[PDB]
Point group: D3
Chain length 231, copies 6
């Protein structure tokens, strides 16, 4: 593919998708055995290794619909990837969304025009693969990892003067990130399975930051859920 | 409320929501003990009775976003209803959606303008209550009822010259109905729990009709899931 | 048709269209001779009888664009109906619209997406059949029934947090209902004649309700205009 | 006003509004007594004279929503004009619209964004003043002038590569012009009375032109209706 | 063409485009030798003469996207015009835009729907011909004419209750007029060269008017730039 | 700032903005003296060094409106950056755009919803800083670097099933990239100066690729123009 420098078979059937390529490196080195880096193009690293003797890949996506759309499209179309699991963070937009909660996104709202480009007057509601979601849910429940299932907002503007997150929160939306709508829409359009698993990095509306310790803990829980759901 | 002639306490915390008021009558009389009809306004019947000694109501909604929106808003705001379960049918738009499958909607797409009216440039993705969905899922799995979890399309025009169901099917959408987006959006906006459970009445694209026997069978499975999930 | 259980010839060339199927029953029994009920599907009753020896039908439509669209499409396409006259009520949105006024809608505005679905960037302005409107107008004038001719708003949300009726009233719009845009657009698309005749059930902005006596009186005037215009 | 060089009282309560300022001159000189030109700014002539001893003004508007909007706004706001009657032509878009027919517009569709600018998700349907329309209708009928009442399309692009007039014609729309939506919307927003009366200059879809004789004849009928309706 | 009464070769390769046809007359008579009026249709005058022995035409456009679109389309398609230079005025919307500044528009924003009609979900950004712009820029700089290069707003409503000029000014937009988007889009679509050169007639937000002397001076500078850039 | 790990004064007044952080490293090391890396967050490298004794920074932006928007907003708001020069590539969409041409973007079209989010019914046309553009233009002309000035398309979807680049090319648009609209809109909103300078990496419509040698050559020309314009 244009943006990924891998050879055939170098990428696994299951790919984890952090936004930050340095977090892709961290995940692969920390969690997987026998790791190879299959991509260095643009420094958007991708790695493959094994978890309990099963091949797992980890590919950074960058930030925003347009950047993840590139990687997801190439993974699916050039590398025949079957399962695509974003592992990332979001800003919580409700008080009931706790800093320790691991979020499994059933769907996502968005201000990206990517679906109105395709559908015009239709509001397309992207949808997580239920089999992936349920496995992740079971995995959290089994260990007692606090988990919340609901929807998120996929934003184009991290700094948005016209943000509607107040209203989104009142409609039940849990948090704001910049990737999910693209991942869920593209995977579904190609008959692949996708899921986004998210930690909470702060509460956007109260400005209240999560501590470095809290983040390390939730990150490990997210990765454990991602992996465990998958073996 | 304006459209429902009930007194306080006459409607249960849990309401099943068929589109057809005559199917509301059928459900209440067939499945519940000690049934009272609490509403006859516009002939949109609503009933309350018990299932295993727990109060359950059944309220017809009519067809279309605008009609269900009336009933859902009044149930929530005037009767403090907590759990709202549409039990209805849809036209399947994919071959892999089988006539015996009971559909649990995680979300719904729509050509209704109801959310663009509220959100403008935002695509709002409605979201089922996961607790209700998982209970329904468990209930089906427990008995071996075939069940499929994914998304549906909420249509304004049953006869639509500009239908995009071809494209919707390619994006993974399972079927087309006329209520879900409204139910999920309104329940969520008011902090209530909603779920839509759907049988398949035909395949819209092949014109192939489900038999009367097939429909009777799936209808009973839907109601059993609706109830069982709830006790 | 899918939603109407009639046989050919059972429905007249001229059909009155109340929203409430129980009001369809009331109209047919009260005004017409030799009445037969040709439809009981979903309890959305339809009747045919005679008025001065001329066949007239009366078909409930339900509430909302999507519900009337079903009945209108089936009446036109399966039953070759020629004249379609909604007889209903609306909430007045101006002080100069009096509680006794019978409204004849020349056109209707809407927040339904049904026409943007068909036309995209075009604002489609639906249009009453002038021959039907003028006959109704003449009929009112002949008896001294107060009558106002202008436009209405066809709303998707009876309970609308984002209502623009304040601004609509300033642009001259008389009142808000939930059917007209669909009736006028569908009839015109198929070369049939349509008209909506409306009473005033309240003033939405002042909350001021019309009395039961006032409503009985205006209802009879509406029906008299509907009929008289037609014989 | 900014664009009209008249003094107070120089413009009548009733103004005829041709698009072409040279046709304004023709109308005033040909039909009215004791004519004064009250405006020469931009050569968009405006005249006042009498018809049967009643003051009538005639003001050119130019072509397009934006140009008529200027003149209509200034006439209403600076000159307290009460009745505004466009007298113009249109391209017929249906075969049943005959070259001799004088069109009275009940409403107009448009691809101008002027109402979406004000109303967003609402389709605003402009509405002729029924009193003006009925007088014009009566006036034609009295003399046997062929007259058709229905809707027109207000176009921004005389040369439109993306024209939807085919579809508009199927929905019953009679013809295409470039002014009506603005006139009807602005007059209504300010509590004034407006009407558009139109001749047919050609059939857009067949390219078939009306003869110079046909045009002279229809023009005189239009003006006669405009005037007669008004005295 | 339909709206221009000229014969072939009567219009030059280069046409100046004032909005006001009386200003077209003024420009031609004041600046050019051996002038002929080639168009009197609708009193939208067009003239051709010579400037330093080179043929130059001057064509009024009227006000608004729809009116200039007519003239520009006919000039290009029927008269094979190569260079199209609007010479007009605008209302400044920023304090830093001085009354003596001559504006060269690189692009224009708009509330016209003309490009959404063609492109739907795409924001089309029109673009001046850089060769024309640079020549005009050089011409001003050579003589010391104060000149500002940036963008303008093409408005449909001179009187706009929903104006966003406050926000437009904060994004750097210099002023508001009613023609540029159309000129730049149409010229580009047909492979011709266009440029808009504008004087400042007032500051819209402070209501502060430019004096008649200031306007005479800037007008002459605009015309000098238009001409000089061209010889 | 959240995404950039620099201290105050570490970033220059002038920042070059390649999409690829590895190209930021290449540029800084190859062209500048006394280079320090001020940012390693997410591996989106930023460097500062000197060019002819003047401080210049080079900051990778990532791909897509949302990713560059992050970096541009933080550069402006936290580091008081004055001049922002994207140096990147695009896919040419016209035959007349040659592989050796260096493109200076006056404006950009887009399918991003970022401006409709802010402006609704307004098409916002972003605008390059003319002073930056003219300096870059002069710099190319001085050395004989082939240079083309016009507009580009800022795309959200590198792989777009609904691409309108065919039509965009006919309207004169030169090429497609994924950043410019954001850079130009954000810089302008904050009173900073921006310009995008682009090489051609291929012709999207013919699939014809530029050679590695051609790309090395054009890249050096782009950087030379970027720098020279600036000293
Ligand atoms: O406000 C934000 N916008 C987008 N993504 C985010 N992730 C955390 N906060 C945000
Ligand atoms: O085509 C349809 N449209 C809406 N609802 C439906 N339910 C079954 N078929 C349909
Ligand atoms: O507010 C309303 N909305 C829609 N229809 C109505 N009919 C009376 N009031 C209303
Ligand atoms: O095609 C046209 N467009 C707009 N107005 C018209 N008037 C006659 N023909 C037309
Ligand atoms: O406010 C205005 N709108 C449009 N054009 C203008 N030219 C000067 N002022 C204006
Ligand atoms: O097709 C493309 N899309 C976006 N950016 C690009 N840069 C080169 N080609 C492309
Ligand atoms: Cl494996
Ligand atoms: Cl992330
Ligand atoms: Cl946001
Ligand atoms: Cl109970
Ligand atoms: Cl149903
Ligand atoms: Cl549909
Ligand atoms: Cl009969
Ligand atoms: Cl009704
Ligand atoms: Cl409303
Ligand atoms: Cl008088
Ligand atoms: Cl006209
Ligand atoms: Cl058109
Ligand atoms: Cl010459
Ligand atoms: Cl002008
Ligand atoms: Cl404006
Ligand atoms: Cl320095
Ligand atoms: Cl790049
Ligand atoms: Cl594209």
């Amino acid at each position: 593919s244009v943006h990924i420098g891998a050879e055939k078979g170098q990428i696994a059937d299951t790919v984890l998708l952090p936004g930050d390529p340095l977090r892709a490196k961290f995940i692969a080195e920390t969690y997987l055995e026998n790791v190879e880096c299959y991509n260095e193009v643009r420094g958007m690293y991708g790695f493959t290794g094994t978890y309990k003797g099963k091949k797992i890949s980890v590919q950074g996506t960058g930030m925003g619909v347009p950047s993840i759309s590139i990687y997801v499209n190439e993974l699916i179309q050039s590398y025949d990837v079957q399962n695509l699991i974003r592992v990332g963070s979001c800003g919580a937009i409700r008080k009931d969304v706790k800093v320790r909660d691991v979020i499994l996104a059933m769907t996502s709202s968005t201000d990206s025009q990517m679906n109105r480009v395709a559908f015009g007057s239709v509001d397309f509601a992207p949808c997580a693969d239920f089999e992936l979601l349920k496995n992740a849910y079971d995995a959290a429940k089994d260990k007692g990892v606090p988990v919340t299932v609901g929807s998120v907002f996929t934003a184009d503007q991290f700094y948005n003067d016209d943000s509607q997150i107040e209203k989104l929160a009142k409609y039940g939306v849990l948090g704001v990130e910049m990737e999910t709508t693209a991942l869920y829409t593209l995977a579904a359009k190609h008959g692949r399975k996708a899921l986004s698993i998210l930690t909470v990095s702060d509460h956007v509306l109260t400005g209240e930051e999560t501590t470095a310790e809290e983040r390390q803990t939730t990150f490990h829980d997210m990765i454990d859920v991602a992996l465990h759901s998958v073996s």
